[PDB]
Design a protein around this nucleic acid. Structure first.
Ligand SMILES: Nc1ncnc2c1ncn2[C@@H]1O[C@H](COP(=O)(O)OP(=O)(O)OP(O)(O)=S)[C@@H](O)[C@H]1O
Ligand SMILES: Nc1ncnc2c1ncn2[C@@H]1O[C@H](COP(=O)(O)OP(=O)(O)OP(O)(O)=S)[C@@H](O)[C@H]1O
Ligand SMILES: Nc1ncnc2c1ncn2[C@@H]1O[C@H](COP(=O)(O)OP(=O)(O)OP(O)(O)=S)[C@@H](O)[C@H]1O
Ligand SMILES: Nc1ncnc2c1ncn2[C@@H]1O[C@H](COP(=O)(O)OP(=O)(O)OP(O)(O)=S)[C@@H](O)[C@H]1O
Ligand SMILES: [Mg+2]
Ligand SMILES: [Mg+2]
Ligand SMILES: [Mg+2]
Ligand SMILES: [Mg+2]
Lengths: 252, 164, 495, 327, 319, 255
DNA sequence: AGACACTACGAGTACATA
DNA sequence: TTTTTTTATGTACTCGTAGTGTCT
């Protein structure tokens, strides 16, 4: 029997809306540390994982770890009924054939429960052991969303180049944006950091990046880890955990 | 107005120039027009089905009857003439005919009630009912059976076997 | 708890499914061909699919599998994909598959690698193609079809792809499946052999504590008509009550599990024109109700197929004192009566309740009148192509008549029957006798009735019999034709 | 006012006691509604037998004067598709009544014109919602209804109205109207009805209008025959006798004068001669085969038009050639 | 008249598989399957009113126990069953997680499966193949030919046959014992005769006769229920003399209110399903019946046309 | 004769918008007290009853009780051709005939005279809502609309439960199950947000969602929806106009 | 004030028909 | 062993410009 309580439903609503279009079914594991959930795209090209710890929950009770396989469309329809001023509460019993989303209002006597029926998903939970990424850079998420929206309107394939402490986002008419790593003390949020080991050459699609950049609402800074023989990792920070995206490159 | 119509009739073919305007001009079809004249004084005109060889005066008889009933003023407002040159499928019968039958009868003027009987019902005539499909014909059944208080149906055909 | 599976909870179909390629029953040639085609896929891609080997596989970047349902196409494809070290991306008709949907979801995977191949295995490089995709599209024949739909999108995707594209369907010779005629390597899974299915049945029988003799498996297969899945389901369904079926209860089992499948528009022609069916013994076995259901299997081609090849058989039901010509004439009379009935059916008032009658007059009676042996081969109905040709010629003649109405003042038929025998000698004949200096006369003649070059070319195609211009136009010297077509695009013509 | 409705509509039965002809069905329906056990009804019968009147009077007896609101009446005039079923009929069956307490009644009048998909969707609506609503299907042809839908309702066959019931209704009308009717005229009226009350009422109104008097006289057979344009048995038998006995020219002249003096139709004469020759006891059935075949062919040709004189001569020649074998 | 009672077809509707008097083989098969579990995909076909829907309902009920409400998805022909429904709702139910006993499975009952569109039937293939370990499909139809072969290949085929006079008589005797109704042997025989292997029609006619006359007698049964339509038509067509067939057509069919279209359709069906005469004679009779039907449909439907049809049939039978 | 001159134009427009796609054939009755109209749904499940007194009109004159029947589609078509700044005037002759809808502008001489031909509907005017109700309640329009169109996405049926000082809306479907529990409370600084409830016996009854989604469309007229429920009684959904009232009688489902 | 997700009424395309 | 066919109402699916309530 798990019982978790947020401070406001807006946090979980935005967390779900960040990746609501890349996957339809997702397995939320529940341990004593927190909630971890990874979901692979229907085309198996984009893997979206997330981890939220106890710091984001007002109350957290998880006696035993349990995996809840739930859809995102029905969960979105359910969460759309809740208000931003309500205290969301996720409740689950033993053998959780369903999950209760309880909305409490603090200044009115209104209690809105929504019981959602979980799915039976093949939980092939792959390990996320750390791989030494060749390049690890970080830049604000808003400019990332803008540049991806810019290159998306020109073509579908987007090539990323990490070379000689320079970042290149090129779309093949043919457009190109070149980024320099400059650290600013007066504005620590726009500090575009970069640690490069090998020059990396990656190539992704349009729709995947367009759906990844829509999650640029939880963190003002996104970290990009790239390797020639490993999928790119786009990490967005949270108040307690983090939301990572794993995107596969294109052929050469 | 009247003189223009007289001149137009005088400059029309003899078939249309000498078309019977009253129920007295019909010469040989006396059995039907006798009932049509006797029901003109009453108000219980039933649903009628004219059938026979072509050129016997069915359309002329129904036109003369509607005229003698409603006058040249209500002749254009209390009639619904549906010929074979129009669409008469299930859709037409269900929408247009049923909406006209469900309508209330138009109020007669002061000059209408003084010279004409002005019955409390209207007439929906369907000329050349041979071309009407059997389903569109069966659709007319309850349409004519329930709204008989406000409308009256007059089918006209040559082969009575073509009607269900 | 959830991962714990129970063998008494799985069907005999899935609990005994093949786990390796060596367990598939029959059709070894097709499975081996698919394996060789998928093994040599990257080697072909390296040379832009130009190099071709002795197997003939390597020029087609995509493969299609077609056959009856339940013979192991999907299982074979999946097993080959798993044994060749590839990542399976399987989609089918159960998921939304349209043009827009395929462009959104699948189109972004024809040139992009997988994302789980990295997470699966990276420490040991077993094969370089482990990071590659295989697109197994099952139930291709279940798409919407038409001008707009995912069928054409997949047909065009089959031309430009960097990942193997396997297609699985149950019906190949379909109009919607027409774009796939020359773009992918077609493999046909046929009726499996009785020996492999017999061995598999013996195995699943001794495993399930079920008694079975090998003498019944042949009958089971021939009543099932090549579907191991239905045989397995039959065994699982009847084994729960009867634990032994050798020669006693097989009659009712076969009579209760007979496959009621619709015959192709060519098999209906064979069964309809079968003389044994209309015999005194065959009549009480294949009753008239079955003969009418035969027509009702496909009521759009059965009358045409009957009328096409009813006079191309050797009758064996000829009554004493009746020749073949008399039976053919009676069959043709009944064909005309069925024609009248069909015209009354597909006309106004929608008299479709006369469809059973059209069954007898158009198909059953003419076949019964001429039933017997097939002399040659069952010819496809040529009435459709002739109707299309006549419609095209009627359109052309209508254009010609509407062009020359300003001068002829006659009807379409009145111009085809009367004007063309003179228009031919006015336009074409001066070319055969006067060389290339009769060009001005022909131009003036075609101008006087507002004719065109395309109209001139279409006019000469209507004549038949002893007057065919298909060789006369070739007999004309090319210089004369060149001068004519050059003068056409030079002089102005008043429409 | 009701005095403006036609006689077919004015004399529509409002209670189950005014529905004549059907006694085995009416009594069983009354017992059904009295004991409460009312199953799904299927009133199958020819036109003008009193199915719609019966079900309307039944709904009136069940719900009172509130019939038009507690009953869902659908007919061919209304759009009846599969979506119409799914929405309207299912929502009417699933919910409760708005004005009182009791089961609901869905009167699918003329349901022989419904689509096969509509019946396939309705056959499970009848079986699922069967504790709070009922279904009554009216039909003239039982072949247009699927056997699945046909097996869920109790079938009541409305027989054609017999002599006694039509005579009783005629007497009721003659009491309601200032009208007198002759006995032989009444018999002829029964003969040209085939159990159709609509035809009887229509021709009765027409003969009352034909009287041309303040109705101080009686309606005789002549008035009826001149009203419906039907041939008299006298002229019928005279034409038949002239055909069977007289010469070709004499029979032709007799047929011409009979059909031109009274303005009779050839189809009516054909039907009358067929009805008369049905009682004729003849020799070997070949003559009957020829007669029936040729007369049906001539009737089918008349049903499409043509030359009336040629068809009359064809009738004469066909009858003569048929009776030429009975020797 | 304030409230009504449930009909005997719904009141005495079987709720256990033992109360079904249908085909003993398939009923015992379903009983053993529900007792052991592991119910496979099935397609039950037959004629109306023989116990197909009740059979699968009893199977699902006895197999799921109290979890019937949350484990059974019932979809009839009255509900939308297009490609969109199969894509969304059926797939959501098949993917829905439910903790069931270790011998049961979620059941998807699809009544009138012969009415589903081709797209939905095609989409259901992988839907039933990918979740065959936690979701089972039971189709109930009247014509197995309307369901595509790919769907039939993944399930068992149960063809229900007509109910013999013994089974219907036993069920009627059980209903009478449970209702305490005065009956007679000839009345029950007439009920079985007019039922034609239709149990539902038999129970309906029995209830009608009981509530209309009180005593189940052959006289009352024949008075409230007319003789079967196809049998009188068969007797008319099989007549040896033209006069006998004409008298039958006049008295039994025409004088009782049977329309000409129904008569000609029943004649066509009887001649098609006839077995007494040869194939050629049946073909000529069907040809003449269709020639007559072509005139009946044009509005020329009268007694003279049927008389001419009978005369032509007798002339054909006159060698 | 009949003369009903409104003060504005959009009033009748919103009045007809309240049940535009809800019913089809209406039969207005104009008497000395005001216009009253009851209309049954096509499926005979709900009854719309509207009553506008002589308060909402600028001028009202009715000699004898007149009955005008009309289809809502043609009435909507006629009303859409009128400008929102015009003045509406319903006119009827001595005998009931085609109603004259007159649009008269206030600044320019714009006389838009439409004539809507009447229907002949069976005037089966009954007397309803004269029965005692087991439970009565009242709550804001926006809250009811939100709850209805939020529970309509989870199921097609909505079960309302009135227990001792407890209101409950339950929606049990296939993809999920929702339940909203509002409690009676009366505020003083905002007297319009109060949710009043007078219950005598517990009520448990289900309705359809396709009909509640059309009932909530009437929330554009008023802001305090009243709901009257009882065992075997039509659910009364009342919107209170400034002159009359618009009440929907919904039929509960059969459990 | 406005942009854009949600959405429901409408034109086009086929697909059967006992 | 293989291609096509006029029309008529009911059914189902699809894209889709459009009308309006809502959030950055
Ligand atoms: N009984 C009649 N008395 C006088 N003139 C007649 C009579 N019948 C026909 N006519 C003449 O014939 C013309 C045609 O009359 P119609 O009523 O159109 O004939 P019809 O019966 O309608 O034939 P159709 O339309 O082909 S079925 C009339 O305008 C008259 O001039
Ligand atoms: N050759 C075979 N040998 C053994 N089992 C087989 C064979 N073919 C089919 N099966 C069984 O049938 C099951 C399903 O086979 P599938 O390959 O999915 O059928 P299919 O040939 O693809 O036809 P579909 O699904 O209608 S397109 C397998 O899991 C096996 O249990
Ligand atoms: N048994 C009857 N007793 C008295 N009047 C009858 C009877 N049957 C018919 N009528 C009269 O005929 C009129 C029409 O009856 P309906 O019940 O409408 O005919 P029907 O049986 O429904 O056949 P349809 O409508 O053509 S399918 C009634 O209004 C009565 O005036
Ligand atoms: N074997 C049986 N034993 C007892 N009652 C039966 C039997 N078969 C049918 N019935 C009765 O018939 C009623 C309806 O049976 P159904 O199963 O609905 O008919 P069906 O076989 O499904 O054919 P359909 O539904 O028309 S396709 C049941 O409620 C029972 O009252
Ligand atoms: Mg005319
Ligand atoms: Mg497969
Ligand atoms: Mg009727
Ligand atoms: Mg059933």
């Amino acid at each position: 029997m798990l019982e978790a309580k947020f401070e406001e439903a807006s946090l979980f609503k935005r967390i779900i809306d960040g990746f609501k279009d890349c996957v339809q079914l997702v397995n939320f594991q529940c341990k004593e540390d927190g909630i971890i959930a990874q979901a692979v795209d229907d085309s198996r090209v984009l893997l979206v994982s997330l981890e939220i710890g106890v710091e984001a929950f007002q109350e957290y009770r998880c006696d035993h770890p349990v995996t809840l396989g739930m859809d995102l469309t029905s969960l979105s329809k359910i969460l759309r009924c809740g208000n931003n001023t309500d205290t969301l509460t996720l409740i689950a019993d033993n053998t959780p054939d369903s999950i209760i989303l309880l909305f409490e209002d603090t200044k009115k006597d209104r209690i809105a429960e929504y019981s959602l029926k979980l799915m039976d998903i093949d939980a092939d939970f792959l390990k996320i052991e750390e791989l030494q990424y060749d390049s690890t850079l970080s830049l604000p998420s808003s400019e990332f969303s803008k540049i991806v929206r810019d290159l998306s309107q020109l073509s579908d394939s987007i090539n990323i180049m990490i070379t000689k402490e320079t970042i290149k986002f090129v779309a093949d008419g043919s457009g190109s944006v070149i980024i320099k790593p400059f650290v600013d003390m007066e504005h620590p949020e726009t500090s575009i950091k970069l640690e490069m080991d090998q020059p990396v050459d990656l190539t992704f699609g349009a729709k995947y990046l367009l759906d990844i950049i829509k999650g640029s609402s939880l963190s003002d800074r996104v970290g990009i880890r790239l390797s020639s023989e490993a999928p790119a990792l786009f990490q967005f920070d949270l108040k307690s955990g983090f939301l990572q995206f794993f995107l596969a490159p294109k052929f050469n | 107005s009247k003189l223009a119509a007289e001149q137009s009739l005088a400059q029309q073919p003899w078939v249309e120039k000498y078309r019977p305007k009253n129920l007295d001009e019909v010469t040989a079809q006396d059995h039907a027009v006798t009932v049509l004249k006797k029901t003109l004084k009453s108000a219980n005109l039933p649903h009628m089905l004219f059938y026979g060889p072509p050129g016997t005066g069915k359309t002329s008889t129904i036109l003369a009857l509607t005229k003698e009933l409603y006058g040249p003023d209500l002749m254009k407002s209390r009639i619904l003439e549906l010929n074979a040159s129009d669409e008469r499928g299930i859709s037409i019968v269900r929408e247009k005919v049923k909406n006209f039958a469900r309508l209330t009868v138009s109020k007669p003027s002061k000059h209408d009630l003084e010279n004409y009987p002005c019955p409390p019902y209207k007439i929906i005539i369907l000329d050349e009912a041979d071309s009407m499909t059997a389903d569109a014909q069966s659709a007319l059944r309850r349409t004519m059976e329930t709204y008989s208080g406000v409308t009256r149906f007059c089918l006209i055909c040559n082969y009575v076997t073509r009607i269900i | 708890e959830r991962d714990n599976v129970r063998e008494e909870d799985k069907l005999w179909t899935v609990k005994y499914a093949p786990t390796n390629l060596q367990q598939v029953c029959g059709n070894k040639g097709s499975v081996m061909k698919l394996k060789n085609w998928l093994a040599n896929w990257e080697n072909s891609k390296k040379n832009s699919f130009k190099h071709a080997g002795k197997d003939g596989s390597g020029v087609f970047r995509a493969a299609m599998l077609y056959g009856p349902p339940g013979i192991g196409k999907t299982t074979a494809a999946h097993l080959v994909a798993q044994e060749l070290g590839y990542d399976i991306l399987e989609q089918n008709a159960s998921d939304v598959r349209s043009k827009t949907l395929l462009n959104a979801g699948v189109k972004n995977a024809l040139d992009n690698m997988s994302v789980v191949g990295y997470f699966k295995h990276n420490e040991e490089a077993q094969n370089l193609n482990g990071k590659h995709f295989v697109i197994i599209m099952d139930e291709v024949d279940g798409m919407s079809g038409g001008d707009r739909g995912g069928v054409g999108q997949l047909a065009q995707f089959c031309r430009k792809t960097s990942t193997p594209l396997i297609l699985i369907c149950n019906e190949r010779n379909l109009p919607k499946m027409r774009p796939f005629d020359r773009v992918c390597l077609d493999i046909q899974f046929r009726r499996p052999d009785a020996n492999s299915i017999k061995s598999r049945l013996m195995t699943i029988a001794i495993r399930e504590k079920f008694k079975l003799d090998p003498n019944v498996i042949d009958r089971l297969i021939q009543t099932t008509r090549g579907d191991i899945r239905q045989v397995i389901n039959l065994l699982s369904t009847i084994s729960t009550t009867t634990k032994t079926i050798n020669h006693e209860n097989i009659n009712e089992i076969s009579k209760a599990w007979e496959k009621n499948i619709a015959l192709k528009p060519f098999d209906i022609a064979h069964k309809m024109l079968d003389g044994q069916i209309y015999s005194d013994i065959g009549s009480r076995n294949f009753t008239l109700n079955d003969k009418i259901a035969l027509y009702f299997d496909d009521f759009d081609f059965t009358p045409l197929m009957i009328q096409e090849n009813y006079l191309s058989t050797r009758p064996s039901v000829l009554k004493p004192g009746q020749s073949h010509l008399e039976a053919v004439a009676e069959a043709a009379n009944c064909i005309s009566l069925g024609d009248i009935v069909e015209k009354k059916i597909r006309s106004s008032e929608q008299l479709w309740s006369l469809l059973p009658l059209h069954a007898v007059l158009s198909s059953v009676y003419p076949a019964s009148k001429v039933a017997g042996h097939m002399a040659g081969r069952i010819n496809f109905t040529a009435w459709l192509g002739q109707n299309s040709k006549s419609a095209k010629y009627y359109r052309l003649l209508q254009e010609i008549h509407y062009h020359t109405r300003l001068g002829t003042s006659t009807d379409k038929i009145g111009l085809r029957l009367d004007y063309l025998p003179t228009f031919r000698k006015r336009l074409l004949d001066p070319f055969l006798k006067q060389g290339a200096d009769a060009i001005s006369s022909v131009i003036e003649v075609m101008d006087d009735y507002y004719l065109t070059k395309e109209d001139w070319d279409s006019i000469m195609e209507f004549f038949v019999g002893p007057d065919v211009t298909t060789a006369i136009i070739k007999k004309i010297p090319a210089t004369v034709k060149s001068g004519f077509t050059r003068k056409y695009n030079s002089m102005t013509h008043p429409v | 006012s009701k005095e403006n409705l036609p006689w077919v509509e004015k004399y529509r039965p409002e209670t189950l006691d005014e529905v004549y002809g059907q006694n085995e069905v009416i009594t069983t329906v009354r017992k059904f509604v009295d004991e409460g056990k009312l199953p799904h009804l299927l009133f199958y019968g020819p036109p003008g037998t009193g199915k719609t009147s019966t079900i309307v009077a039944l709904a009136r007896e069940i719900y009172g004067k509130n019939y038009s609101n507690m009953v869902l009446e659908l007919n061919a005039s209304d759009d009846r598709g599969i979506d119409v079923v799914r929405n309207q009929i299912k929502d009417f069956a699933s919910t409760r009544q708005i004005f009182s307490k009791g089961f609901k009644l869905i009167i699918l009048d003329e349901a022989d014109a419904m689509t096969n998909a509509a019946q396939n969707a309705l056959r499970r609506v009848i079986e699922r919602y069967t504790k709070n609503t009922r279904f009554c299907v009216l039909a003239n042809y039982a072949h247009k209804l699927t056997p699945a839908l046909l097996s869920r309702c109790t079938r009541f066959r409305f027989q054609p109205l017999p002599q006694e019931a039509i005579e009783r209704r005629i007497a009721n009308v003659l009491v309601h109207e200032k009208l007198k009717l002759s006995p032989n005229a009444e018999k002829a009226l029964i003969e040209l009805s085939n159990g159709d009350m609509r035809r009887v009422l229509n021709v009765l109104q027409s003969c009352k209008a034909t009287l041309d008097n303040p109705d101080e006289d009686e309606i005789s057979d002549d008035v009826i025959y001149e009203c419906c344009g039907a041939p008299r048995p006298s002229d019928l038998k005279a034409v038949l006798k002239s055909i069977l006995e007289d010469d070709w020219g004499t029979a032709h002249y007799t047929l011409n004068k009979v059909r031109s003096a009274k303005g009779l139709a050839l189809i009516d004469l054909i039907e009358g001669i067929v009805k008369i020759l049905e009682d004729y006891e003849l020799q070997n059935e070949e003559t009957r085969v020829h007669l029936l075949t040729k007369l049906a062919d001539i009737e089918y040709s008349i049903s499409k038009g043509g030359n009336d004189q040629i068809q009359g001569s064809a009738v004469i020649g066909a009858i003569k050639a048929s009776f030429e074998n009975e020797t | 008249t304030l409230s009504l009672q449930l009909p005997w077809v719904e009141k005495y509707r079987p709720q256990v598989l033992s109360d079904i008097v249908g085909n003993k083989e398939t009923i015992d098969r379903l009983q053993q399957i529900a007792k052991d579990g592991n119910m496979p995909h099935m397609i039950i076909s037959g004629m109306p009113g023989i116990g197909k829907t009740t059979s699968v309902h009893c199977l699902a009920h006895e197999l799921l126990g109290r979890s019937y409400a949350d484990g059974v998805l019932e979809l009839n022909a009255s509900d939308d069953r297009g490609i969109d429904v199969v894509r969304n709702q059926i797939k959501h139910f098949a993917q829905k997680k439910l903790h069931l006993p270790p011998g049961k499975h979620k059941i998807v009952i699809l009544d009138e499966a012969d009415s589903m569109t081709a797209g939905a039937q095609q989409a259901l293939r992988r839907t039933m193949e990918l979740y065959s370990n936690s979701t089972r499909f039971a189709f109930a139809c009247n014509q197995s030919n309307k369901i595509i072969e790919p769907l039939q290949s993944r399930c068992a085929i149960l063809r229900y046959s007509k109910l013999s006079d013994e089974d219907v008589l036993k069920r009627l005797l059980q209903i009478i014992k449970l209702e305490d109704v005065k009956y007679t042997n000839d009345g029950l025989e007439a009920i079985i005769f007019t039922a034609e292997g239709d149990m539902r029609q038999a129970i309906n006619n029995l209830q009608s006769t009981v509530a209309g006359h009180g005593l189940v007698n052959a006289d009352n049964v024949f008075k409230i229920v007319d003789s079967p339509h196809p049998l009188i038509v068969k007797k008319m067509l099989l007549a040896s003399n033209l006069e006998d067939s004409i008298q039958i057509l006049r008295t039994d069919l025409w004088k009782k209110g049977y329309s000409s279209i129904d008569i000609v359709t029943t004649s066509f069906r009887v001649t098609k399903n006839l077995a007494q005469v040869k194939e050629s004679v049946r073909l000529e009779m069907i040809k003449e019946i269709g020639l007559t039907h072509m005139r009946i449909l044009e509005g020329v439907g009268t007694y003279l046309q049927l008389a001419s049809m009978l005369a032509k049939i007798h002339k054909l039978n006159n060698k």
